[model samples]
Target: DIQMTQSPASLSASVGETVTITCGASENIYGALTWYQRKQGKSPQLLIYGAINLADDKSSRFSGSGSGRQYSLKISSLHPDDVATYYCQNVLSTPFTFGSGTKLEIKRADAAPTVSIFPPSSEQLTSGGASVVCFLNNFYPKDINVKWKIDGSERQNGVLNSWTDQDSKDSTYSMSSTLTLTKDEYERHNSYTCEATHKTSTSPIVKSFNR
Candidate 1:
């Protein structure tokens, strides 16, 4: 299946502000579409699909409206509880893909960008094994920390990494982090995660990897 990716040129909304997400399909799928919201450390939840059909056991507060090659998801009244990244995917094809995501925050909008790397992803390692790299993109706040933990145990004095600020044309801030693991370390480790803490939102965002 052809993969689809989406990047929001602008995403800014105040608390209780309405937000909309738009995604375009590369080819017609005869109406096979899906939407999901992903919070740190948690799996994504399907919100809508088939253009405007709500998934079973979902709340009405989240709705979808649009048609054909172009579609949009609308959140009427965004709540602090709704702050997270939203992604759109197409299930009609093989090898599902996701949008870059729109990160919702609570506060007067300001740009804060940073990127981190553990052992710096650029470093070369032995071959014949897999290398797992965790990335937390469009991050803010320089003090946030990203690290590696193996088999439910934190590596003593885990490596520290940081990035320079990145400003978009619109003046919004963005940042990212990367962690490299040897194939053995990546396989033996039960849990590998990418975490980000920022000032605009109340909770930390974490994305866990599954072997």
Candidate 2:
């Protein structure tokens, strides 16, 4: 049985920073190391193998070393565009496995998400249990947290969150959340709010709805 343990499940570095990630092989890898880089919503692409062979569309900044049972991958002079998850695999033999994975992120920019909350138009705000929709747009990486609150407390009843890929040029995203509430839950409860948190912005984006 072979196992690959990856250190630093996640990482953050500056634009010009160079970072190294290490992987440990349960059995002798014999210099058989394969590295990959993957961005949000895209297929993983090989970057290195056999500790030295460059993969397709080689990135000059990507490098690797080590042998037998230990190996390492280094990304030098990092660029914001290089922010993505990285992984390693053992091509040595079966019992084939991959590193746990390491995600690299760059310092966030000032791309605040536009959040809006919409209360159901039809039916009573109480009897039929109105549905409130929260829309989020123009965010990067699509990694965000959407939450709902009634009055001042958080509640998880009938809440749903979804996303859509909107990165045709620069990688950004759009997503929405919906909450359905009973008459007392929505009308009687009165103050309801939608909250979103993203790495791009320092603070959470909040939208509130009131009777």
Candidate 3:
């Protein structure tokens, strides 16, 4: 089986600003890595493969090229339409898997929250407690709130931290929260979510998972 990993944990971009999303494979994919874009409340779409071929009529803002196992998806000028979730996958073999997701929030006084959930792995689920990471990223104005919920109940034990893109002129910000739960909490609530509410879009960007 092949494995992959994405860095920085999150991405944020402003209007007309360029952004880069990267993907890598465990080994040579023969330049067969593909980039996919997904939007909330909409069906995911395949954009390009081999990081070189586009299905058709894409955009100058969306382009990618690959070298061996490493590939990248770059957006030239961030737009409202460009505010979408993106991931990478490869067809070099039958056992393909999509990489972790990244997103862009268009430049604005306040952009909608974009989040990801690093669910608890089986190794963390022992006879006692386990830890999981929830990331809230790609929001403008640089200030927001991240909350956690187990099953249907609110939680307050999450350890929260803030991160910013170094050397970027924009004010977009990202926050990550780690939640620790006991075995009883795990068995009691199989549905865990990271609920992020921004000052601009307060509805909360939520990522949910089954335990």
Candidate 4:
């Protein structure tokens, strides 16, 4: 796995002010850069990666521009609610790695409560369904864990339905994971989570839901 190191663990910006985080690869990683926004107690959502490719359903304000081993994620019109931890990752290797993260805050700002739903929204599954699957596409890091949690209770086991890893011409890595849930488990709207734990940092990317 390529080591990813990010600078400026924290940053302060005002609304409309742009904030940037630099992700550096230990070696030449071509275009395997990905940016993510992670809020408290929520799954990390992809912002930018593959150098400048925007992930699905992401806002246009979030843009990535860079090359080689150095790349940056820029938030054009920084919103007051944009305050959160931003992370960078390298998709150049099997176990994709993430930067330490930069916590963006409003400049000399006041605290206002903001409520945000994550994994960006909940996915509903029918009961007693066979092969209930969820796909988180355009993600790096082949090493991932998929499991089922019954009404927040522990289940015996789940399965990794499938995974794909492809190297771009520039030599960067892009991957995806598909998780399969059993029919009995799917009936109760069981909370299924797909987690990717990178080698560079202790934090892991997780998604969960319940019936």
User: What is candidate 1's local distance difference test score?
Assistant: 0.61
Clashing pairs in 3: none
lDDT of 4 at 186: 59
For model 3, the superposed segments whose C-alpha errors exceed 4 Å read: 107-211
Best first by lDDT, ranked: 2, 3, 4, 1
Is 2 or 3 the stronger prediction by lDDT?
2
User: Per the 3 Å backbone cut-off, how many clashing residue pairs does candidate 3 have?
Assistant: 0
Better TM-score candidate (3, 4): 3
How many steric clashes between backbone atoms does each model show? 6, 1, 0, 2
- Expressed as tens digits, the lDDT of each residue in 114-142 for candidate 2 is 89999877655535768889999877655
Output the worst ten-in-a-row residue range by lDDT, candidate 2. Answer: 164-173
Q: Candidate 2 clashing pairs? A: 126-183
Q: Over all chains combined, what TM-score does candidate 1 have?
A: 0.51
Q: lDDT by residue for model 1 over 12-131, one digit each (tens)?
A: 565677888788778775567788888755889888888688889977878886566676888888776676678888777776767677665544444332333243233344453444
Which ten residues in a row are the worst by lDDT in model 1?
113-122
Which prediction has the highest TM-score against the true structure? 2
Score each candidate by Cα lDDT. 0.61, 0.81, 0.74, 0.61
Estimate the Cα RMSD of every predicted model relative to the unseen true structure: 13.3, 4.5, 12.3, 15.0
What CA RMSD would candidate 3 show? 12.3
